[PDB]
Design a protein around this ligand. Structure first.
Ligand SMILES: O/N=C/c1nc(CCCCNc2c3c(nc4ccccc24)CCCC3)ccc1O
Ligand SMILES: O/N=C/c1nc(CCCCNc2c3c(nc4ccccc24)CCCC3)ccc1O
Ligand SMILES: *[C@@H]1O[C@H](CO)[C@@H](O)[C@H](O)[C@H]1NC(C)=O
Ligand SMILES: *[C@@H]1O[C@H](CO)[C@@H](O)[C@H](O)[C@H]1NC(C)=O
Ligand SMILES: *[C@@H]1O[C@H](CO)[C@@H](O)[C@H](O)[C@H]1NC(C)=O
Ligand SMILES: *[C@@H]1O[C@H](CO)[C@@H](O)[C@H](O)[C@H]1NC(C)=O
Ligand SMILES: *[C@@H]1O[C@H](CO)[C@@H](O)[C@H](O)[C@H]1NC(C)=O
Ligand SMILES: *[C@@H]1O[C@H](CO)[C@@H](O)[C@H](O)[C@H]1NC(C)=O
Ligand SMILES: [Cl-]
Ligand SMILES: [Cl-]
Ligand SMILES: [Cl-]
Ligand SMILES: [Cl-]
Ligand SMILES: [Cl-]
Ligand SMILES: [Cl-]
Ligand SMILES: [Cl-]
Ligand SMILES: [Cl-]
Ligand SMILES: [Cl-]
Ligand SMILES: [Cl-]
Lengths: 532, 532
């Protein structure tokens, strides 16, 4: 039977699931590690001990213990991102959708979810791999990993809480795919890791980390890259936040051993309730427990690794959405609301600017203001709103990614860059937020192919295109079909820097994605701050 | 007879001249000072001693001793600016065109020529006042003043060469108009001074200088303002250049008295031949002998006078041409030629930038480059050319003037701002130079009204408009006619900052003339240099 599979750790029994008037096989909730519970909290993951009998892999597993967004209770725009299963520290599981009948050896894609390293779930409806596996004849894995303090509490020099264990979670899932995916009809030689935002930064991190490079063939990054300002902290800052967590929880702070014993003594929700309190003064665009530049997982600084070519050299496919700052402003910047147009005074604009670069001196603040003000009229509320939105997205997502794209292309074996600027017709978030970060994912997983979802027919075509770009890139390292007849997505080169738009209109090619702004953030503003 | 006039210094006999199928009276070459010759070289002007008999005022006088441009021998574009009369140190004369028959009391306009304080003549064909006097029923004066070392050698603390004597030349001409213009049918209560570039800066200077304010009613500035970087030097720099002149000429440099005695001993052309040698290292956009901030003519620094309201408060009408940097680049920047399109490499662009701000540190150079580069393609020769042209014009003319406009409007009694962006159809200078500095003057003097000149009929209309704007402003302090029916030129206010385009198309109103760039030059780049 095609729903039974022997793996190096035991038999698993999957379930037959329907998809677009057909059916495929799904293996939900396969364990890939020992449950990181008890005195294993904070520790590096251990592999799942082998089990006798058959593992019931017919239903989704628990989500990891995380913060849950309650800003807009009952609102679908926010709750579609929350855990839809019971939360638990026993959460290290993966899911697999296998085409029917079981292929002999086909391309594998491993999804890494985002959520700022403080949240995320492999079981969300937008991450349901059955449409992609079915439409494109791939094996679709989605892994899970510890978020929050549970996965990124960094007390460097200790071995009970070294940091980065959530990335080690992802690595173990990749090791598991390498060792077992053959039995599910997946080709372990042709594994593409892809992920969005925090998962995009994660993919990039795996490309950099020597201990991860041999576990996958190529990589896709969506709206995230490892050098993003929110995606890592220094060893000193991670230790400061870990101590600050213990102070919030009446923990003996004398030794790492005693700090950690107290943190292990706590219930999961106690850690979560206080985790935003360890942030520095400027915290509106930051997350508490993120990967740490530890000299182990990352041998040196990310920038020196990028400069010296110290990273896996393969093909990469990556891009951004038009409006990457909108959620940051809505959730954290005073003056933005879900239900207003969020027009911004000249006064409110200056504050946003200050918030955006809180360590800039007066000269740096003036530089950002000069760069993003419409001087033909200062007090246009919509212009001020759009300008602040551009600041936040450029500085936290787009220009980090562009920096990563440029450094990587000097050494890699093929870069493909995209700019996704189509707002879904059925988007429930307000109009001012635009082409929102995260709202290309539904196209990548083929949600528009489902009629009930209320997408337009041109949105079904786009999704079909994007799924085919993605899966063709995964199979061959080029998103374009061999000598087909549609518009070709050109290689991103150092001298020409071409990229494409992804939207419902016919594809056109452009060059130099937001280069003026990225030159400001990546080259100019650093030099100005290092000189005052 | 209407060609004879008694003045406080003697009788003058003018000549009848034809103009546009009519005739007016012209009084050419009236002396307003003692000839500044011999041991009067460098000295403040003395008034013309009264003469017996009748002064033959039928022919143009001598031009002052100046550098003569020979870059393009026989080329009309350059030679129309050179002295068209014999040069002489005996040059302090003025010219008057009086409508026929002689009015009883009509508006007076006094032209101050430009030429960077090193050159210029009141007798050029583009400065012929007969079309303006005739068409608009004004009395047209054009004065003259010592240029070069003869008018601006500044040895502060001495009384033999204090500096600014060329501005004192202009002041004496204004004093003469105040005292005598009544006899020519001009209204001494309604005198408008106007001038272009160096003469525009001169007009502004008269507005600032307490000893000049009572000699005129209102003022017009074209492509020049007193705070322009090329328009004044400090007392220390003027003394340095005066000594450096003596070093070039084998002069005893022990005392001011001996330095000056040697300089007086020289022939005029000896001073001219060496005058560009006293410039500092960065000299391509500078002129050797310019007005000096001396504590006398200018009580304090120009900027403090502008801040504190220390200046004559009246109506002003001023503006710029679209392409103010073109002559600077053609004559001084390597890579520009009269007969090529002057496309500029990326390499040549950086040099221009360096030349433009030679004292900027590396950070300042990057700031200008970021501000003016087209980053969508760096190596477009036409873009690089236009960008450098914009840099030079913004920094040396447009943004100084805009700074002057903003400070003045806070205290004055009415500002009118214009942007002249029509390239004359018959312009002999190359196309890449654009709407060139200086090529609105022919429109202000009504040259297009003369058919032989080969202007289009729409250029005749524009000239008619501009002459009427100018002369109506001179008569009433508002360029617009009382409740007429054409488009009104709105007042420039601090909050709205409206200006008009002047061209052959119907007039439209805009706001905030090059405010982004002017904010860069006037506010941002200063703060950045004061901080490194
Ligand atoms: O961005 N919203 C910011 C934000 N929220 C809240 C409400 C949720 C409670 C804390 N929750 C979050 C915090 C922060 N960042 C978050 C990002 C996503 C979800 C919750 C966050 C940063 C500062 C500390 C708290 C309060 C203040 C905020 O400043
Ligand atoms: O701008 N041309 C610049 C320029 N010319 C020449 C040829 C004319 C001789 C000097 N003559 C002028 C100079 C300068 N500025 C001038 C401006 C107008 C007319 C003559 C000038 C500045 C530097 C010293 C010489 C040589 C070098 C130049 O660098
Ligand atoms: C697997 O678990 C689900 C939910 O507990 C249950 O309904 C299902 O019958 C189980 N399947 C097997 C084969 O035990
Ligand atoms: C990728 O690598 C192969 C060699 O393995 C090389 O021939 C090819 O040109 C490379 N492509 C790019 C875009 O670097
Ligand atoms: C689709 O649209 C209908 C309105 O016709 C609405 O009732 C339904 O809830 C929508 N479905 C989704 C999934 O939004
Ligand atoms: C004035 O001078 C000119 C030129 O020298 C001469 O031709 C003219 O006749 C003179 N006029 C009188 C009235 O002397
Ligand atoms: C100019 O001054 C008069 C008073 O003399 C005043 O009434 C008028 O409003 C002023 N106009 C401007 C534009 O300042
Ligand atoms: C006007 O154009 C004619 C050509 O028809 C030319 O010969 C003449 O010199 C031009 N006149 C001027 C003043 O440029
Ligand atoms: Cl086996
Ligand atoms: Cl379905
Ligand atoms: Cl390497
Ligand atoms: Cl900052
Ligand atoms: Cl970069
Ligand atoms: Cl008299
Ligand atoms: Cl004529
Ligand atoms: Cl005053
Ligand atoms: Cl400089
Ligand atoms: Cl200003």
């Amino acid at each position: 039977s095609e729903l039974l599979v022997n793996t190096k750790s035991g038999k698993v029994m999957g379930t037959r699931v329907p998809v677009l008037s057909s059916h495929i096989s799904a293996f939900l909730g396969i364990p890939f590690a020992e449950p990181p519970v008890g005195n294993m909290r904070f520790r590096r993951p251990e592999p799942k001990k082998p089990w006798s009998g058959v593992w019931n892999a017919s239903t989704y597993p628990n989500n990891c213990q995380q913060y849950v967004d309650e800003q807009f209770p009952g609102f679908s725009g926010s709750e579609m991102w929350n855990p839809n299963r019971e939360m638990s520290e026993d959460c290290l599981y993966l899911n697999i959708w296998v085409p029917s009948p079981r292929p002999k050896s086909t391309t594998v894609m491993v999804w890494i979810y985002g959520g700022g390293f403080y949240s995320g779930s492999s079981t969300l409806d937008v991450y349901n791999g059955k449409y992609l596996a079915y439409t494109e004849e791939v094996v679709l894995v989605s892994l899970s990993y510890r978020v929050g303090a549970f996965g990124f509490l960094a007390l460097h020099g200790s071995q009970e809480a070294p940091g980065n264990v959530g990335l080690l979670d992802q690595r173990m899932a990749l090791q598991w795919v390498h060792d077992n995916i053959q039995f599910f009809g997946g080709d372990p030689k042709t594994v593409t890791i892809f992920g969005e935002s925090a998962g995009g930064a994660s993919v990039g991190m795996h490309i950099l980390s020597p201990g991860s490079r041999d576990l996958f063939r190529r990589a896709i990054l969506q709206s995230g890259s490892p050098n993003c300002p929110w995606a890592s902290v220094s060893v000193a800052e991670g230790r400061r936040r870990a101590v600050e967590l213990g102070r919030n929880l009446n923990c003996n702070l004398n030794s790492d051993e005693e700090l950690i014993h107290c943190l292990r003594e706590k219930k999961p929700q106690e850690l979560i309730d206080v985790e935003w309190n360890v942030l520095p003064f400027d915290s509106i665009f930051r997350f508490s427990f993120v990967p740490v530049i530890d000299g182990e997982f990352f041998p040196t600084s990310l920038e020196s690794m990028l400069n010296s070519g110290n990273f896996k050299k393969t093909q990469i496919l990556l891009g951004v959405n038009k409006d990457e700052g909108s959620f940051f402003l809505l959730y954290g910047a005073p003056g933005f609301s879900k239900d207003s147009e969020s027009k911004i005074s000249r006064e409110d604009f200056m504050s946003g600017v200050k918030l955006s670069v809180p360590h800039a001196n007066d000269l740096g603040l003036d530089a950002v203001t000069l760069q993003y003000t419409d001087w033909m009229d200062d007090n246009n509320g919509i212009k001020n709103r759009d300008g602040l939105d551009d600041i936040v997205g450029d500085h936290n997502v787009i220009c980090p990614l562009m920096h990563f794209v440029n450094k990587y292309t000097k050494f890699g074996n093929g870069t493909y860059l995209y700019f996704f600027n189509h707002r879904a017709s059925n988007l429930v978030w307000p109009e001012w937020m635009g082409v929102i970060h995260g709202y290309e994912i539904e196209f990548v997983f083929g949600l528009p192919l489902v009629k009930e979802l209320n997408y337009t027919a041109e949105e079904e075509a786009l999704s079909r295109r994007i799924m085919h770009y993605w899966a063709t890139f995964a199979k061959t390292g080029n998103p374009n079909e061999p000598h087909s007849q549609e518009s070709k997505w050109p290689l991103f080169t150092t001298k020409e820097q071409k990229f494409i738009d992804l939207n419902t209109e016919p594809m056109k090619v452009h060059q130099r994605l937001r280069v003026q702004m990225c030159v400001f953030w990546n080259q100019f503003l650093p030099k100005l701050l290092n000189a005052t």
